[PDB]
């Protein structure tokens, strides 16, 4: 019954970077695929009306993203936070 | 190709529930349409101040035939899914 959520990185991806930022998230995307909370990664380019690349992750709560992103590591970008009012499938 | 769009609205302090309400009713007139897959209604916490709208298609034309098609009677941002995990 927690409430779903969703960080959106809004990242500045210059023109011609395209194929090596999305070869790179390719692998990103694999250190988050099987975490705690984790439900969905998503990796918009922008068409209209936006210019910066939209990296998408939902997660169960807030605490399952801040046990990911707080842990541990190996070693302009803005983060808008969400929260999942509701959801329907295709 | 997959696409994504969201509708960034400004909404006011209060004005809230009352979108939240209704965008319950609008969901209903989408989650069977022909290339939909999945709907979504955000609201802001940080970073952020409008309400995104995100509705995930099968392809553009799948969602301007919904979109453009007969009816009964705000920033739009469209997107491309390079990927999708989970």
Partial sequence: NAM???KINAI??????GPELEKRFAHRAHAVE?????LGFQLLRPVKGEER??????WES?????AWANGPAIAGAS??????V???GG
Avoid at 12 to 17: D, L, Q, S, Y
Avoid at 34 to 38: E, I, Q
Wanted: hydrophobic residues 50%; without cysteine.
């Fill in 53 to 58: 690349y939209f990296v998408v992750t939902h």
């Fill in 34 to 38: 099987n975490s705690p909370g984790f």
């Fill in 86 to 88: 509701l959801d329907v």
């Fill in 79 to 84: 983060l808008l936070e969400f929260e999942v």
């Fill in 12 to 17: 500045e991806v210059p023109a011609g970077a």
């Fill in 4 to 6: 779903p959520v969703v």
């Fill in 62 to 66: 807030d605490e399952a993203f801040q």
